[PDB]
Design a protein around this motif. Structure first.
Motif, mmCIF file in Angstrom:
data_model
loop_
_atom_site.group_PDB
_atom_site.id
_atom_site.type_symbol
_atom_site.label_atom_id
_atom_site.label_comp_id
_atom_site.label_asym_id
_atom_site.label_seq_id
_atom_site.Cartn_x
_atom_site.Cartn_y
_atom_site.Cartn_z
ATOM 1 N N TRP A 113 -8.431 2.706 6.000
ATOM 2 C CA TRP A 113 -9.206 3.929 6.120
ATOM 3 C C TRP A 113 -9.187 4.489 7.532
ATOM 4 N N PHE A 155 -6.078 6.515 7.717
ATOM 5 C CA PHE A 155 -6.353 7.812 7.109
ATOM 6 C C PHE A 155 -6.973 8.773 8.116
ATOM 7 N N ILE A 156 -8.018 8.330 8.819
ATOM 8 C CA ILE A 156 -8.715 9.199 9.769
ATOM 9 C C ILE A 156 -7.781 9.615 10.895
ATOM 10 N N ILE A 205 -1.755 9.086 2.814
ATOM 11 C CA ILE A 205 -1.955 9.355 4.233
ATOM 12 C C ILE A 205 -1.130 10.559 4.663
ATOM 13 N N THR A 207 -2.882 13.638 3.526
ATOM 14 C CA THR A 207 -4.009 13.854 4.460
ATOM 15 C C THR A 207 -3.479 14.572 5.706
ATOM 16 N N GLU A 224 0.833 -1.226 0.000
ATOM 17 C CA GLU A 224 0.000 0.000 0.000
ATOM 18 C C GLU A 224 0.858 1.263 0.000
ATOM 19 N N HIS A 227 -7.029 -1.894 9.111
ATOM 20 C CA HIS A 227 -8.032 -1.079 8.370
ATOM 21 C C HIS A 227 -7.316 0.164 7.845
ATOM 22 N N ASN A 277 -1.096 4.461 -0.939
ATOM 23 C CA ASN A 277 -1.869 4.955 0.190
ATOM 24 C C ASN A 277 -1.065 5.492 1.362
#
Ligand SMILES: C[N+](C)(C)CCO
Lengths: 416, 129, 70
Positions: A321, A324-325, A268, A271, A261, A319, A264
């Motif tokens: 996502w 990400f949060i 991140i 983000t 990943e 997870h 991603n």
């Protein structure tokens, strides 16, 4: 006597925020496409990192001389110097477009490092000089935002401008177009700073600036005989350096826990820096309304400790996502803190120059980041990621309590 | 999840003296870009002997004195595979070539200041005769 | 320095890392194994020998480029 604000305050803040964006782009441009520059030059990933690490090493020493020039020469001189160095760094990087010209790109990035010492702690001086009460904390955040947006843009522009082709002659053509863009914007921002950056408005924008106007080592002695500023230096260093150690090791974490990943992991990181741009702004928009600088600083800090814990204990829940949060919430709070810390420093040490205060805060954050990054890479390789993450949580928990013993000694507020 | 780390050595075969062979070491669970890979050889009648090491990050290649000038260590980060070219093999180069990994992840702040790294993961071996 | 590693090799199998950084135990290694540094002197100890402990143990130096095994 007369306290009036002019409209050139925006012009000056926007011109500064824009070449701070350009400087922050120059810091990260080489990394965004590191594997492409390793091949173009034939150097190691270590050699390409030195490009990004040089910004951080130059600041710690050159802070004290740069903050003296601030008071010995003024804020227009500092602006012209910083903009000119940002322009020079950028143009010297056009005699580097040959695989065997890595020394010259480093010469360019050092010059671009020296330019930062004239940019990074200056937001609060410009706010004080140009912006009045109820808007001083927001200019400082418009500048911090200009910097964060340059780091973001810089993650996104080099992979688009330069493809991962191995041809030494066409890659040089693809790096020419990035170097030309940046040179031609650093020149434009330079020429404007010489046109529109006044050393001071005609009238003081605030009642605190009006009274500020009415030895360097003595003033450095006096900031360190002030306990509320010592605590803030330590705690700002802890928080911002944990942010640095978090960002440096973020990619490594996501590849360990989500192997395959890579797209991603970089997402991140974007983000973190995008959430951070928003929190920088709102923290400042909240402080120039409420004036709640000790309570904001504590709640944010405590929100950077809750966030590092949740990130810590959610990295292996499988997870992506959620990562990400969590990483987006950290960057939000840990970048909203930086403009808040600068302005709380200017409140605790009011008559003292904003340059020295913000620069000492930056030097702390850069020292603690280097220390935490060295320490964490040693803990993770030998004990795991959760331990290196807890390390950051325990220095954030220690910093939370230290933040709470800082008094709400708001002098610039008392001078209105 | 944290994929488990595996090093797989291939290439080893009997070769005539003055023969050249190229061993490989596929790497799963980690990237040859963040870790240095070492080659160690054991002959049936001998013990463990260190051949060569490459750091992708530091761009460094180091060789054992006996192997120097006949062995080149190299790495393809795009395949996560490291290799060894043994150009002029001697009858005393007959051994089990094992590819191992250092414990240290290489990054700008990487150091041996508290903990000196060691050879964490090892391959099964591939024999060269 | 403390750049000494203790490996265990059982016949026809690869060396396994027991102790590194002179005294640091690697994850998963039985706690009977423990290493000590005393100047240029290095000692590996199995606190309770076990049917498993029968093997060959190699000391290694990683302080300098030419990695040298005992
Ligand atoms: C803060 N950075 C080092 C990322 C850039 C300053 O221009």
């Amino acid at each position: 006597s007369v306290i009036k604000v002019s409209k050139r305050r925006w012009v000056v803040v926007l011109v500064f925020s824009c070449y701070s964006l350009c400087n922050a782009f120059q810091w990260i441009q080489y990394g965004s496409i590191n594997n492409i520059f390793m091949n173009f030059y034939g150097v190691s990933a270590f050699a390409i990192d030195w490009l990004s690490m040089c910004y951080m090493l130059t600041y710690i020493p050159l802070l004290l001389p740069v903050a003296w020039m601030l008071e010995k020469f003024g804020l227009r001189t500092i602006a012209i110097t910083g903009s000119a160095l940002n322009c020079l760094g950028a143009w010297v990087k056009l005699g580097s477009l040959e695989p065997h010209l890595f020394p010259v790109t480093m010469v360019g990035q050092v010059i671009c490092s020296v330019a930062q010492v004239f940019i990074l702690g200056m937001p609060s001086r410009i706010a004080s000089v140009w912006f009045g009460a109820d808007e001083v904390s927001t200019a400082c955040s418009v500048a911090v935002f200009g910097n964060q947006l340059g780091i973001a843009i810089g993650f996104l522009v080099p992979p688009v401008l330069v493809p991962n082709i191995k041809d030494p002659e066409k890659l040089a053509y693809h790096i020419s177009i990035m170097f030309y863009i940046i040179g031609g914007v650093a020149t434009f921002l330079f020429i404007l700073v010489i046109i529109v950056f006044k050393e001071k408005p005609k009238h003081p924008p605030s009642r605190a600036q009006s009274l500020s106007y009415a030895s360097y080592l003595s003033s450095i002695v006096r900031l360190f005989k002030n306990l509320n500023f010592v605590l803030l230096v330590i705690t700002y260093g802890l928080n911002a350096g944990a942010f640095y150690a978090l960002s440096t090791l973020l990619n490594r974490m996501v590849i360990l826990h989500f192997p395959g990943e890579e797209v991603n992991a970089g997402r991140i990181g974007l983000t973190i820096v995008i959430a951070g741009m928003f929190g920088a702004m709102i923290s400042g928009i909240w402080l120039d309304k409420s004036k709640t600088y000790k309570e904001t600083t504590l709640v944010v800090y405590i929100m950077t400790l809750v966030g590092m814990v949740v990130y810590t204990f959610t990295l292996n829940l499988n997870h992506l996502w959620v990562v990400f949060i969590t990483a987006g919430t950290l960057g939000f709070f840990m970048t909203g803190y930086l403009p808040l810390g600068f302005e709380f420093a200017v409140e605790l040490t009011y008559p003292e120059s904003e340059g020295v205060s913000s620069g000492l805060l930056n030097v702390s954050a850069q020292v603690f980041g280097i220390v935490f990054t060295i320490s964490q890479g040693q803990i993770i390789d030998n004990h795991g990621t959760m331990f290196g993450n807890i390390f950051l949580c325990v220095f954030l928990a220690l910093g939370s309590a230290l933040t709470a013993f800082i008094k709400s000694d708001l002098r610039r507020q008392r001078a209105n | 999840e944290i994929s488990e780390v595996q090093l797989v050595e291939s290439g080893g075969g009997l070769v005539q003296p003055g023969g050249s062979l190229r061993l490989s070491c596929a790497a799963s669970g980690f990237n040859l870009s963040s870790y240095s890979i070492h080659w160690v050889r054991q002959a049936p009648g001998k013990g463990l002997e260190w051949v060569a090491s490459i750091s992708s990050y530091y761009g460094s290649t180091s060789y054992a004195d006996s192997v120097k000038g006949r062995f080149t260590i190299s790495a393809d980060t795009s395949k996560n595979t490291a290799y060894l070219q043994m150009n002029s093999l001697r009858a005393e180069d007959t051994a089990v070539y094992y590819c191992a990994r250092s414990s240290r992840y290489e990054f700008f702040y990487s150091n041996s200041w508290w903990y000196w790294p060691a050879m964490d993961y090892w391959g099964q071996g591939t024999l060269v005769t | 320095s403390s750049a000494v590693a203790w490996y265990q090799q059982k016949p026809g199998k690869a060396p396994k890392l027991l102790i590194y950084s002179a005294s640091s135990l690697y994850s998963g290694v039985p706690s009977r194994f423990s290493g000590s540094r005393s100047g240029t002197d290095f000692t590996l100890t199995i606190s309770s020998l076990q049917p498993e402990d029968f093997a060959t143990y190699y000391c290694q130096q990683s302080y300098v480029n030419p990695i040298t095994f005992g």
